[PDB]
Structure formats: structure tokens, C-alpha cells
Amino acid sequence: MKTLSAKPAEVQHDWFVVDATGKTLGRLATEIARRLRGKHKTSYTPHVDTGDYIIVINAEQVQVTGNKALDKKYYRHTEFPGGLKETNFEKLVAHKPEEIFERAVKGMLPKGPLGYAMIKKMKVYAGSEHPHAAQQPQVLDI
Amino acid sequence: AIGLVGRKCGMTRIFTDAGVSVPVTVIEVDPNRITQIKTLETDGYQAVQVTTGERRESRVTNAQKGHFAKAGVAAGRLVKEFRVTEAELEGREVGGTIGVDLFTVGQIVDVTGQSKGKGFQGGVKRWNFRTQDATHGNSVSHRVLGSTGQNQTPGRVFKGKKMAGHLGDERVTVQGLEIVSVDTERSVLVVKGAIPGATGGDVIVRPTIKA
Amino acid sequence: AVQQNRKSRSRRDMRRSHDALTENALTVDQATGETHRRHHVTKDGFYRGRQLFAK
RNA sequence: GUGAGGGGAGUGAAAUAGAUCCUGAAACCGCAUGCAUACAAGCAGUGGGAGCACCUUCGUGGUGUGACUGCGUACCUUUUG
RNA sequence: GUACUCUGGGGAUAACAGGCUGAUACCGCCCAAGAGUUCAUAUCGACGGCGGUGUUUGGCACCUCGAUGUCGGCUCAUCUCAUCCUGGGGCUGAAGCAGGUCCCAAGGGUAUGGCUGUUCGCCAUUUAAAGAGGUACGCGAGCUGGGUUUAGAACGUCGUGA
RNA sequence: GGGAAGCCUACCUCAAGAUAAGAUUUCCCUAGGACUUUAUGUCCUCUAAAGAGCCGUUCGAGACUAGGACGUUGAUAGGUU
Ligand SMILES: [Mg+2]
Ligand SMILES: [Mg+2]
Ligand SMILES: [Mg+2]
Ligand SMILES: [Mg+2]
Ligand SMILES: [Mg+2]
Ligand SMILES: [Mg+2]
Ligand SMILES: [Mg+2]
Ligand SMILES: [Mg+2]
Ligand SMILES: [Mg+2]
């Protein structure tokens, strides 16, 4: 009984800003998911969301190593008999970087209602400016 | 593309000087009244919203009354938008009138309308299926669909299978019709060919997009 | 064709949830002051200031 | 409806002992209260667990519901299985 | 002897379909005498070797005999490329019009009849072409029942006879 | 850098349940109390707005639905000419 769990009403979330220019996608995604689930806080509980809000700036400036700029392929399938769409990483990050980051972070998050609630705490913007200026976010290293 | 909203009046023929009979369709056009102009800074796109027809004051709500009073025009029976560019927006201010003089004789256009509804229809009429034999021991199955798919692989019906259902009563656009002539004193446009919809329906005439 | 398993009472009630009834349009007559179906003749024979079956 | 049926009065220790008549259970079917439930996938439970509603010998208590979460593919026979 | 049959039982045990395997079959690759011709590794190619898929014929008996009920035809489709046409190229005994080999390419299209139950095959006439396959050799709680495989009768062979 | 009926656009239709539920124009609702657990608190008194629906005459809309037009300020349906 002595081991207590975090009260969902007493959890506070604080806003952070991460700059994604010239950073590797995998390491940044792992760090974002770790700070988004709440593993850094001492009151961490597996069934309560205690993460923080993360805003990503300069989403199109993310980089991948090797030849993954042209070989990394993203597949989607509409349940129609011939609807298998395939796209490349280059064009995708050219016109929709938010999908790239959302995929990368959702792949490393739990699958369920709690994961769906955790994924909403992440904002991704292509430009260098974000509308969440009223929440007073603090700059984060990485 | 600036267009017109007219009403199909029926079909007729027109004899040329050489004697060739040209099947034509008549579209009566009440002079459209420009209601609103949408620019980039306030809405994100440039367009012209017009209205046409006549409606009694009992059927027009207070919101539409205020909208038309702000526009300074009389209430029409319907309202339609047209996506235009800034080049086509010259001399297009609210309260104006888009007459039938927009088109010229010999122009290629596109006509959009609402097809006639046939109701719940079967496969033969909807997807041009083939009927089975009516004799040689054939059973009650005469105009049925037939087979549906494979048995165990995949073991289900694929999405998009052609089956019986509702037919007609849908937006249809026919391109490539030549305006055989326009009459301004009667405010009508007679155009070669057939257009979708029955007599009395609303149709939209626009300049061709393939030219 | 016939079912392979029973249908629980929950699914039965969920299907029956569209079987609710509805009321009719009843109004008070201006002349007789009695409740009657709208646009219908009163049971005594009166409708819209007129009287059928004169007694 | 001079019907069936029911509500009063009365008899009776007792009328949910009223003639479909001792006691009268389960499957099955209604009504009322309390909680949960209309963006989230599977033998429907189990170990945790916030909140809500009534009780109090007012608690590191009781009674109901229980969002969120880890794990988890019924029973019997016959078989190498 | 039972095809006039019946009972108790089995996927402990066969015929159809699935699974494992790839002897057989299909395709690809390496070396290469020789050949059309007197030479061009332009084009085939003996004697030998190494692999790939699971479309043929086979092997094994793991699911099904207290039932997975069909050879072909009709209607309706979906997928692969080992590409029939249309598209883009390299080489050539490519003057041009044409032909041959190989590479890329699956968007679309990809016949009507005669003879047989036919799948297949033969024939007549068209087209740019009348491709090869998988999906319980697709589809029979969608249709047909012409063939096979119940009960009747006859011929040919065998049996004294059933 | 050039480069194909291949891919993305381009053509037609659907599409904010896109729970990420978007945008634009206009219209409507501005009273008096009591109590408690002082909270978008609970009971009273006084008005029911803009609109939607029920109903009726009907359709080139339609299985039932849904959708379009009209309801004395009316040509919506029948009749008459
Ligand atoms: Mg036919
Ligand atoms: Mg499946
Ligand atoms: Mg969602
Ligand atoms: Mg919910
Ligand atoms: Mg429990
Ligand atoms: Mg064995
Ligand atoms: Mg190829
Ligand atoms: Mg070719
Ligand atoms: Mg079946």
C-alpha cells in the first residue's frame, strides 16, 4: 500500500521547444518519446500520463545518415484491391514533415488509448515560428 | 472561371443555311446578381458568390435577409460560387450584374447539372451486366448478379464490387458543347448537344477547361 | 441459412431500440372546443365552421 | 359491455390462504434507484488503480460502479500431438 | 458374387482438395568441340556442372469418413510478369522497308463459328493482338447436369454359374 | 543534364466522425427571489427568441426514409376555360 501512484488531477505538464535542424531522426525521436511518456519524472506510473508538451521547430531540416534519403520508403494501403501507395523519404519530408515525425514518434509509443492521449501532446511545425507563444515554452537542448 | 447559373427549358432543332438540323438545348438565364467577393487575405482563396431566382419573403430566413441586405441585392432562389482569378475579377463588385453577354457564338463550354434518378436499380441496367439464358432448364436465376469471388482465398468480398443500388441523381459535367447562339432580349442561351437534368432544373455553364 | 450462436439480449435490445412509437398531431377545435386530429373531421361531424349530419 | 378483470367494505388467526386457492426455488421476462458507456479492436477474466454515490464502530473504513494499465486463444473425450 | 444391400466403427487406412519434399517437369547461369559460311562468343550449340519457383507426372500419410459433397459450360471477377499488341533502348549478314537476340516497362486492350460432354486439339474467316499462370486445377447456400459413378435393357470379352 | 502508355500532378466525382471534428457572411437570446456543499451550485416566479419538427396539398425525388417547392401575404394538387 505504501507504494503510491500519481493522481491524474495533480499532474502538471510543462512546455518545451526542441530545434530539429541538423539532427538525426532516430535519436531525436527516441528522446522525444522518452520525455513525452514521462520516464524522466520520479512520479512515473505506467497507467497515468505524466509527460510534457514538446514543440518541434524546423521539421524539414531533419537529416538521416547513409543513403536513406532515397531508399527509405513509406507504404500505406487503402483496403481497395489495388490501393498500395508507396512514397520516398525525400518527397515526404519535402511536402509533409509532420507525417514523418508523427510516424517516427508513434512507432516508439505504446499502442492504446494512453498512447493516443500521449501522441496529442506533441506539436510539429515546419516553419521557425510556432503559435504556442502564450504557454511560455522553455528551450530544450535535445 | 466565371460562369452562369441557368435553367434548362427543353430541347429543339435548328436548321442551318445548308439544311443540316442541329439538335440544341435552351437554357434561360435570369441576370445573376453578385452577392459576395472573396479575396486571399480574409478567406484564403479568391471567388465570386452570386445568387439568382426569386423567393417570397416568408421563405427567406432572417440570416439570409441580413446577408442579402448587406449585399444590397434582392433574394434569389439559389446561391452559387465560382472560383476565379484576380485577372477575371476586374470590374466585379458586390451588387453588380453578370449578364448573358459573357459568352460568344461559337464558344466551347462545360455544362454541369443533376442527372435524373432511376431509383434502386439492378446490375443489368447499372453496370451493363449480361443476362443468362431464359431456357434450357434455367432456374429462377435470370437477371441475378452471379458469382461474387473466390471461396477461401481471400475468403471475402473485395471493396468496390459492382452490385445493385441507387442510380442517377448525381452531379454530372459534360464538356465540349458549342454555344450555337445567345439571345439577349429574351436572355437565353441555345447550345448544341444534350445537357444533364430534366426540364426545370438548375444548370451551371462555364468556359471549357481543356482549351 | 441459420445462426451459429445465440444472440445475446444486449444485441436484441440494440436492434429493438428503433421500434419506438410516436404521437399524433392533436389540436383544440376553435368552434367546438374539443380535442381532434389536425386536418380531420371531428367525431360529431363538425369541421371548419361547418356541420355535417344536421340534427 | 348487466363480460372478463380490478379497487373499496366485510368474513377469516392469516385473502401476495379468493377457488389458475399450503410453502413456493432456477432458467426466462418488466419497472425504479446508484455508477460506467457513442476515437476505439479479440474466451470478456485476473493483479494494480483515479473518480463518483450512499452508510457509518469517522477510517493507513464498509457497500456498488469502476475510466487507465501488465498478462491472458472455453470445458469434456480420443490421441504422439 | 452383391451396382439389391444392411449394421457397428476409422482420417489408426485409401480416391478430390491443402501440407512437407522437388526424384520428374519448367526457367536461369558456367565452360565449351562444332555449325550453318571461308570468319564474325551476329545466331544455335554436343559432352559436363551449379541453382531458382512450386504451374505437370510422382513420393510420404500430418487435417477432414457423428460428410471439405462436382469434369466441363454460363455470369462475375482479382493478382503475378517468365510481355501477345501498343511504349522506350543496345547489338546485328542493321542500305531502306523489314527481320533476329537481349534490357526496361503491367496503364489499357487482349475474336466469331464448324466438328466432339469435352479441358485440349483440328479446320474457316477476322484483328494490333487473339500471352503464360495463381486464386479448394477461382466461382454449383449464384445457374446448368452434357461426361463420370445407383437402381432397367442389349452387344463384344471372361467365368459352368451367380 | 536528356530520357517511356510506368509514379506524382493534371481531367470528373465524393470528401472536416480529417475526434486534427477547419473557414467565411448574417441572424437570436442582456429578470426578480430563496437556500446550501460558494459551485458553469440547487429549488422557485416570469418569458420561450432566431430556427427545427409534427400536419396538409405534392414532385421530372423516392422500397420506408432522405431531398425539392408550396400552405390564403397561394398557382402546390384536382377541377374549368
Ligand atoms: Mg448472352
Ligand atoms: Mg483473414
Ligand atoms: Mg483518432
Ligand atoms: Mg469517449
Ligand atoms: Mg480487478
Ligand atoms: Mg508414421
Ligand atoms: Mg520483365
Ligand atoms: Mg514491344
Ligand atoms: Mg459453401
Domain chopping of chain A, boundaries: 1-142
Residue B27 CB coordination number (10 Å): 24
Contact assessment for residue B174 and residue B193, using Cβ atoms and an 8 Å cutoff? yes
In angstroms, what CA-CA distances link A109 with A23, A103, B132, B199?
20, 10, 56, 59
Grid coordinates representing B164 are 445493385
3-class secondary-structure state, position A101: helix
E-assigned strands of chain A? 15-19, 53-57, 73-77, 84-88, 122-124, 138-139
Contact assessment for residue A73 and residue A88, using Cβ atoms and an 8 Å cutoff? yes
Structural biology method used:
cryo-EM
Residue B195 CB coordination number (10 Å): 21
Considering only CB atoms, which chain B residues are within 8 Å of A80?
Answer: 158-160
Which bases in strand D are touched by protein, i.e. have an atom under 7 Å from a CB?
Answer: 28-30, 39-41, 48-51, 60, 67-70
C1' of D36 to CA of A123 (Å): 32
Strand partners, B109: B177, B207
Considering only CB atoms, which chain A residues are within 8 Å of B156?
Answer: none
Count of helix runs (H) and strand runs (E) in chain A: 5, 6
Give Cα B39 distance to the centre of its chain: 26
CA of A85 to the centre of ligand 7 (A): 22
Query: Would you call the peptide bond into B196 cis, given omega within 30 degrees of 0 as the criterion?
Result: no
C1' of E113 to CA of B129 (Å): 24
CA of B152 to the centre of ligand 6 (A): 30
HSE-CB for B30 with a 13 A CA cutoff? 15
CB burial of B54-66 (b: ≥16 within 10 Å; e: otherwise) equals eeeeeeeeeeeee
Q: Which residue bears the cell 508513434?
A: A106
HSE-CB for A43 with a 13 A CA cutoff? 13
Q: Is B44 on the interface with A (CB under 8 A)?
A: no
| Angle, alpha carbons A72-A74-A79 (nearest 5°) | 155
C1' of E4 to CA of B139 (Å): 34
- Strand F neighbours (CB under 7 Å) are A 85, 98, 102, 120; B 36, 38, 42-44, 55-56, 58-59, 61-63, 65-67, 70, 110, 112, 116-120, 166, 168-173, 175, 198-200, 209-210; C 23-25, 38-39
CA of A98 to the centre of ligand 6 (A): 59
